[PDB]
């Protein structure tokens, strides 16, 4: 809203920091059934609902 | 032929315990038998493999090949022996994972704790 | 190889405070270096050394306070035994072994005897 509470900004900061693809050195680990970031969010597809 | 109520004959539990064994239990899981000469010299049959042990491959395609342990890759349930490798098509070399139950220890890497382990298992002359 | 708690334990609190200050300066300069140098794992050692020095300092302080409070009742609650809350609320051994004078007399007079059948 550009006049946001610190709580909202903090959740926004966490979302920005976790908005990234899978680290590519994962998928080299020994067993590693993890293929991709299945929790990837985008502002155009799914709303954070705060 | 188990008698105690504290041991399980369940295949699922056994496999879970094996595959989720921590590093300290994997050390024991990865024991290797001594060679004939070392079995005579130490009076014991098998020992948990160590990184500087010298081993001879007795099973598999690498049977007869010898070398020194490069790594005890406990996470992979395998050991890597120097100069027992796979040459790739790009010129690189990669270690061959071997299971210690398919090797014989031909020369132990000794220290105070290894000697104490020998004597605790019933080893003669260190 | 980082600091060792058993070596720190032989040092006075002044030396430990000084070592903590030096370790903090070292960590600050190491995280300055990390901005240029990629993949600098040496900072983990200094972080663990700072943790170890703080651990030993707190050990010494808490031991001194335990000595201060030795023997007298009313120790500080974080120095008292942390059993469960119900276990700390439970009757002590002296209580729940308290018996009336009547009960003491009668159970002294007629305890459970040891007797076997022999035919």
């Amino acid at each position: 809203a550009a006049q946001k509470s610190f709580r909202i900004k903090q959740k926004m900061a966490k979302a920005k920091k976790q908005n990234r693809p899978l680290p590519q050195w994962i998928r080299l680990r020994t067993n590693n059934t993890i293929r991709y970031n299945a929790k990837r969010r985008n502002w155009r597809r799914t709303k954070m609902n705060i | 032929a188990k008698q105690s109520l504290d041991v399980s004959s369940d295949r699922r539990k056994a496999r879970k315990a094996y595959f989720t064994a921590p590093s300290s239990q994997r050390r024991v899981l990865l024991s290797a038998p001594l060679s004939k000469e070392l079995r005579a010299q130490y009076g014991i049959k098998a020992l948990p493999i160590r990184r500087d042990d010298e081993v001879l491959v007795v099973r598999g395609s690498k049977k007869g090949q010898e070398g020194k342990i490069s790594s005890v890759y406990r996470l992979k349930f395998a050991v890597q022996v120097d100069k027992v490798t796979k040459e790739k098509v790009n010129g690189a070399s990669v270690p061959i994972n071997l299971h210690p139950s398919k090797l014989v220890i031909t020369k132990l890497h000794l220290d105070k704790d290894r000697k104490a382990l020998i004597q605790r298992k019933g080893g003669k002359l260190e | 190889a980082g600091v060792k708690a058993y070596e720190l334990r032989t040092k006075s609190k002044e030396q430990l405070a000084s070592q903590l200050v030096d370790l903090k300066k070292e960590l600050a300069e190491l995280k300055v270096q990390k901005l240029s140098r990629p993949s600098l794992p040496k900072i983990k050692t200094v972080r663990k050394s700072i943790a170890c020095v703080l651990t030993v300092i707190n050990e010494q302080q808490r031991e001194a306070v335990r000595q201060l409070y030795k023997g007298k009742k009313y120790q500080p609650k974080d120095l008292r035994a942390k059993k469960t809350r119900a276990l700390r609320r439970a009757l002590t051994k002296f209580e729940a072994s308290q018996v009336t004078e009547k009960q003491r007399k009668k159970q002294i007079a007629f305890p459970q005897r040891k007797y076997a059948i022999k035919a």
Partner: protein
């Protein structure tokens, strides 16, 4: 739903009966547990027959008064006539029942007699002596069986 010539049934299953269905799968486990508990209780208590001496007693309700059976405990009168105090009998392994009363000299004499036999067939260990281990026998009821007069 009244069909062909069949007896009228009274199956009471109109409540949520499946919420309370106790299948005794643990019958054998509970038997093993009862035997284990008996063994540890026998080992825990001093050499002592795992149960108190019970009196002989007539069942009520003429359907059953023709037979005799073990009662709860010996009456105060029976214990006194056997020469013990109730407290000491309770400590040396005799069940005492202050509620039961003696109106039958036959039963009274029988209970006094089995009390005397118990006293003559038990050895009480002194609290401060040696009393060498006396080969605990587990059943007082088997040792002093109730006989039908």
């Amino acid at each position: 739903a009244i069909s062909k010539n069949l007896p009228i049934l009274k199956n009471h299953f109109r409540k949520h009966w499946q919420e309370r269905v106790k299948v005794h799968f643990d019958q054998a486990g509970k038997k093993v547990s009862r035997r284990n508990a008996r063994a540890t209780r026998a080992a825990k208590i001093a050499p002592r027959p795992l149960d108190l001496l019970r009196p002989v007693v007539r069942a009520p309700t003429v359907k059953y008064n023709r037979k005799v059976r073990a009662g709860r405990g010996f009456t105060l009168a029976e214990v006194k006539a056997a020469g013990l105090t109730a407290a000491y009998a309770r400590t040396i392994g005799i069940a005492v029942d202050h509620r039961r009363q003696n109106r039958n000299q036959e039963i009274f004499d029988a209970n006094v007699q089995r009390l005397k036999e118990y006293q003559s067939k038990i050895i009480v260990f002194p609290r401060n002596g040696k009393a060498p281990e006396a080969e605990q026998v587990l059943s007082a009821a088997a040792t002093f069986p109730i006989a039908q007069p």
